[PDB]
Design an enzyme around this catalytic site. Sequence first.
Site, PDB file in Angstrom:
ATOM      1  N   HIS A   1      26.889   9.732  17.438  1.00  0.00           N
ATOM      2  CA  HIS A   1      27.645   9.229  18.576  1.00  0.00           C
ATOM      3  C   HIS A   1      28.921  10.007  18.927  1.00  0.00           C
ATOM      4  O   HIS A   1      29.500   9.836  20.027  1.00  0.00           O
ATOM      5  CB  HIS A   1      27.992   7.751  18.515  1.00  0.00           C
ATOM      6  CG  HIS A   1      29.109   7.377  17.622  1.00  0.00           C
ATOM      7  ND1 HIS A   1      28.845   7.013  16.278  1.00  0.00           N
ATOM      8  CD2 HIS A   1      30.469   7.386  17.743  1.00  0.00           C
ATOM      9  CE1 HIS A   1      29.987   6.783  15.673  1.00  0.00           C
ATOM     10  NE2 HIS A   1      30.969   6.983  16.527  1.00  0.00           N
TER      11      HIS A   1
ATOM     12  N   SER B   1      35.004   7.614  12.709  1.00  0.00           N
ATOM     13  CA  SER B   1      33.577   7.851  12.900  1.00  0.00           C
ATOM     14  C   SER B   1      33.176   9.288  12.615  1.00  0.00           C
ATOM     15  O   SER B   1      33.886  10.239  12.833  1.00  0.00           O
ATOM     16  CB  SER B   1      33.215   7.779  14.427  1.00  0.00           C
ATOM     17  OG  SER B   1      33.599   6.507  14.842  1.00  0.00           O
ATOM     18  N   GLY B   2      32.008   9.430  11.969  1.00  0.00           N
ATOM     19  CA  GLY B   2      31.416  10.678  11.612  1.00  0.00           C
ATOM     20  C   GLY B   2      31.933  11.168  10.288  1.00  0.00           C
ATOM     21  O   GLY B   2      31.294  12.105   9.752  1.00  0.00           O
TER      22      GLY B   2
ATOM     23  N   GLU C   1      44.920  25.458   7.442  1.00  0.00           N
ATOM     24  CA  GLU C   1      43.866  25.235   8.421  1.00  0.00           C
ATOM     25  C   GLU C   1      43.036  26.431   8.779  1.00  0.00           C
ATOM     26  O   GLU C   1      43.481  27.598   8.829  1.00  0.00           O
ATOM     27  CB  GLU C   1      44.528  24.644   9.723  1.00  0.00           C
ATOM     28  CG  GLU C   1      45.308  23.388   9.471  1.00  0.00           C
ATOM     29  CD  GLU C   1      46.827  23.595   9.386  1.00  0.00           C
ATOM     30  OE1 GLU C   1      47.061  24.681   8.814  1.00  0.00           O
ATOM     31  OE2 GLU C   1      47.715  22.802   9.773  1.00  0.00           O
TER      32      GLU C   1
ATOM     33  N   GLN D   1      51.102  19.210  12.841  1.00  0.00           N
ATOM     34  CA  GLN D   1      51.906  20.236  12.222  1.00  0.00           C
ATOM     35  C   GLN D   1      51.114  21.301  11.466  1.00  0.00           C
ATOM     36  O   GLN D   1      50.058  21.025  10.933  1.00  0.00           O
ATOM     37  CB  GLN D   1      52.743  19.624  11.051  1.00  0.00           C
ATOM     38  CG  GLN D   1      54.190  19.256  11.407  1.00  0.00           C
ATOM     39  CD  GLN D   1      54.858  18.763  10.114  1.00  0.00           C
ATOM     40  OE1 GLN D   1      55.308  17.603  10.147  1.00  0.00           O
ATOM     41  NE2 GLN D   1      54.827  19.636   9.089  1.00  0.00           N
TER      42      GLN D   1
ATOM     43  N   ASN E   1      47.949  17.424   8.277  1.00  0.00           N
ATOM     44  CA  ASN E   1      48.784  16.778   9.259  1.00  0.00           C
ATOM     45  C   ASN E   1      48.309  17.337  10.595  1.00  0.00           C
ATOM     46  O   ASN E   1      48.395  18.549  10.801  1.00  0.00           O
ATOM     47  CB  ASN E   1      50.246  17.217   9.133  1.00  0.00           C
ATOM     48  CG  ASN E   1      51.107  16.356  10.063  1.00  0.00           C
ATOM     49  OD1 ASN E   1      50.820  16.218  11.260  1.00  0.00           O
ATOM     50  ND2 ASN E   1      52.190  15.746   9.582  1.00  0.00           N
TER      51      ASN E   1
ATOM     52  N   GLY F   1      37.892   6.877  15.584  1.00  0.00           N
ATOM     53  CA  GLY F   1      38.557   8.153  15.197  1.00  0.00           C
ATOM     54  C   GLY F   1      38.150   8.418  13.750  1.00  0.00           C
ATOM     55  O   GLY F   1      38.347   9.546  13.333  1.00  0.00           O
TER      56      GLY F   1
END
Length: 240
Positions: free
Chosen positions: A45, A188-189, A69, A64, A61, A186
Amino acid sequence: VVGGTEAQRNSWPSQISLQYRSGSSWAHTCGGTLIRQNWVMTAAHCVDRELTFRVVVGEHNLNQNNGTEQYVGVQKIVVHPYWNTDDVAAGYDIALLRLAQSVTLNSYVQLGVLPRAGTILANNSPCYITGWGLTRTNGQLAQTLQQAYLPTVDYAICSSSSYWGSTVKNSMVCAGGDGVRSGCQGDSGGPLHCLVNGQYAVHGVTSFVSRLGCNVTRKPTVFTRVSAYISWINNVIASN
Ligand SMILES: [Ca+2]
């Protein structure tokens, strides 16, 4: 996550943030699990919308720079062939995303361990839900990853009339329902991490919560049961 606590940074390294381009910015829309360096597992979905999506791995975060990442585009989306947008209660809320590039594994970025096919957990099994979803029903997204201890609720209890009844199927995992802690929009998945033989494995993909609210007593958060899809998962990765 409702009723969670802040996760430490390298706690859940297979957790991803699935985001879509909104104008000139990107918004977090769902969680996901990194299952291969170029494959992420999420709910079907979350990709119903034909939007431009990217995956963020090694995130902590959302507002920030964490210095950890890695940002990657989604090159192919493979939704379960039986998923039906108008019937989430039917199950099959699972999708695989092939990433544009292979991510680099390090301490912030690791592969999620999947359960052996057909594995069913005992009632009250220790599991954690993780995510950046809403922290209250109709509230706002968390800025940092949150985690909540959410023990399982077996099928017989979860499918009984006081709980979810017939909405819940045996291809789903129920967890929580204490009225305090839960998954919320938020989340979900994202993963449901369960300790099995001294190792945390991803037994659920967050699928839905009650219409009445996220944390509702006797309405556990419902997850797609990953052990029911191991052959499908492997057949997709082998041919794509
Ligand atoms: Ca960040």
